[PDB]
């Protein structure tokens, strides 16, 4: 499912997840998975 992981130890996990998913607000970190909308 995931675009990439979300690691809480990476304080920029939400920005990286957005980058994976195409830009601002497009990715959500839901537990250990970055999921694209």
Coordinates of N, CA and C in Angstrom, one line a residue:
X1 N 0.8 -1.2 0.0 CA 0.0 0.0 0.0 C 0.9 1.3 0.0
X2 N 2.0 1.3 0.7 CA 2.6 2.5 1.1 C 3.4 3.1 -0.1
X3 N 3.4 4.4 -0.2 CA 4.4 5.1 -1.1 C 5.8 4.9 -0.6
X4 N 5.9 5.0 0.8 CA 7.2 4.9 1.5 C 6.9 4.7 2.9
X5 N 7.8 4.4 3.8 CA 7.5 4.4 5.2 C 7.3 5.8 5.8
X6 N 6.7 5.8 7.0 CA 6.8 6.9 7.9 C 7.5 6.5 9.2
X7 N 8.6 7.0 9.5 CA 9.4 6.7 10.8 C 9.2 7.9 11.7
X8 N 8.7 7.7 12.9 CA 8.5 8.9 13.8 C 9.9 9.5 14.2
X9 N 10.9 8.7 14.1 CA 12.3 9.2 14.4 C 12.8 10.2 13.3
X10 N 12.1 10.2 12.2 CA 12.4 11.3 11.1 C 11.3 12.4 11.3
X11 N 11.7 13.5 11.9 CA 10.8 14.6 12.3 C 10.2 15.2 11.0
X12 N 10.8 14.9 9.8 CA 10.2 15.5 8.6 C 9.4 14.4 7.8
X13 N 8.9 13.4 8.5 CA 8.2 12.3 7.9 C 7.0 12.8 7.1
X14 N 6.3 13.8 7.5 CA 5.1 14.2 6.8 C 5.5 15.0 5.5
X15 N 6.6 15.7 5.5 CA 7.0 16.4 4.3 C 7.5 15.4 3.3
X16 N 8.2 14.4 3.8 CA 8.7 13.3 2.8 C 7.5 12.6 2.2
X17 N 6.6 12.2 3.1 CA 5.4 11.5 2.6 C 4.6 12.3 1.5
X18 N 4.5 13.6 1.8 CA 3.9 14.5 0.7 C 4.7 14.5 -0.5
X19 N 6.1 14.5 -0.4 CA 6.9 14.5 -1.6 C 6.7 13.2 -2.4
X20 N 6.6 12.1 -1.7 CA 6.4 10.8 -2.3 C 5.0 10.8 -3.1
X21 N 4.0 11.5 -2.5 CA 2.6 11.5 -3.0 C 2.3 12.7 -3.9
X22 N 3.3 13.5 -4.2 CA 3.2 14.5 -5.3 C 3.1 15.9 -4.8
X23 N 3.2 16.2 -3.5 CA 3.2 17.6 -3.0 C 2.3 17.8 -1.8
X24 N 2.1 19.1 -1.5 CA 1.6 19.5 -0.2 C 0.2 18.9 0.1
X25 N 0.0 18.2 1.2 CA -1.3 17.7 1.6 C -1.7 16.4 0.9
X26 N -0.8 15.8 0.1 CA -1.2 14.6 -0.7 C -0.9 13.3 0.0
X27 N 0.0 13.3 0.9 CA 0.3 12.0 1.6 C -0.1 12.1 3.0
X28 N -0.5 10.9 3.6 CA -0.8 10.9 5.1 C 0.1 9.8 5.7
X29 N 0.8 10.1 6.7 CA 1.5 9.1 7.6 C 0.4 8.5 8.5
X30 N 0.1 7.2 8.3 CA -0.9 6.5 9.1 C -0.1 5.3 9.7
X31 N 0.3 5.4 11.0 CA 1.3 4.5 11.6 C 2.5 4.5 10.7
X32 N 3.1 3.3 10.4 CA 4.4 3.2 9.8 C 4.3 3.4 8.2
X33 N 3.2 3.7 7.7 CA 3.0 3.8 6.2 C 2.6 5.2 5.8
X34 N 3.3 5.7 4.8 CA 2.9 6.9 4.0 C 1.9 6.4 2.9
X35 N 0.6 6.9 3.0 CA -0.4 6.6 2.0 C -0.8 7.8 1.2
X36 N -0.8 7.7 -0.1 CA -1.2 8.8 -1.0 C -2.7 8.8 -1.1
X37 N -3.3 10.0 -1.2 CA -4.7 10.3 -1.4 C -5.0 10.3 -2.9

